[PDB]
């Protein structure tokens, strides 16, 4: 009924919402770090493969 | 017709494929860096908002 209780509830709901937001965003951030690391892996593989191609070429086409 | 020409073509197709792979992955990596930076922004906002909530609370509920 009181301003105090009204505020206690508002603050509690807001706290819960922020905590969930922060928890979800942290998880999502982790997932995105992983997708980025994976893409670098694939990209690095492709660059290695490309330098192997050039070694092959310098030997058999030049 | 010759082994040489057959290999020239294979190497050329493979080079093109690797270049596109590397180009696409770089773009995707950039996009993922951006999504991650954005998530940190939102997450930081939420943490700031949370410490503002606690200041509000320490003043009006304690």
UniProtKB/Swiss-Prot annotation, chains A, B:
Residues 4-62 form a coiled coil. Detected in adult heart. Detected in embryos (at protein level). Widely expressed. Residues 30-61 are annotated as: Part of a helix bundle domain, formed by helices from N-terminal and C-terminal regions. Disruption phenotype: Full embryonic lethality; nearly 90% of the mutant embryos have been resorbed at 11.5 dpc. Contrary to wild-type embryonic fibroblasts that have elongated, tubular mitochondria, mutant embryonic fibroblasts contain only fragmented mitochondria. In cultured cells, mutant mitochondria show a strongly decreased frequency of mitochondrial fusion events. In spite of the aberrant mitochondrial morphology, there seem to be no gross defects in respiration. It comes from the Eukaryota. Ubiquitinated by MARCHF5. When mitochondria are depolarized and dysfunctional, it is ubiquitinated by a SCF (SKP1-CUL1-F-box protein) E3 ubiquitin-protein ligase complex that contains FBXO7 and PRKN. Ubiquitinated by non-degradative ubiquitin by PRKN, promoting mitochondrial fusion; deubiquitination by USP30 inhibits mitochondrial fusion. It is found in: Mitochondrion outer membrane. Mitochondrial outer membrane GTPase that mediates mitochondrial clustering and fusion. Membrane clustering requires GTPase activity. It may involve a major rearrangement of the coiled coil domains. Mitochondria are highly dynamic organelles, and their morphology is determined by the equilibrium between mitochondrial fusion and fission events. Overexpression induces the formation of mitochondrial networks (in vitro). Has low GTPase activity. Homodimer, also in the absence of bound GTP. Forms higher oligomers in the presence of a transition state GTP analog. Forms homomultimers and heteromultimers with MFN2. Oligomerization is essential for mitochondrion fusion. Component of a high molecular weight multiprotein complex. Interacts with VAT1. Interacts with THG1L; THG1L probably functions as a guanyl-nucleotide exchange factor/GEF, activating MFN1. Belongs to the TRAFAC class dynamin-like GTPase superfamily. Dynamin/Fzo/YdjA family. Mitofusin subfamily. A helix bundle is formed by helices from the N-terminal and the C-terminal part of the protein. The GTPase domain cannot be expressed by itself, without the helix bundle. Rearrangement of the helix bundle and/or of the coiled coil domains may bring membranes from adjacent mitochondria into close contact, and thereby play a role in mitochondrial fusion. This is Mitofusin-1. The lineage of its organism: Eukaryota, Metazoa, Chordata, Craniata, Vertebrata. The chain holds residues 674 to 735 of 741 of the full protein.
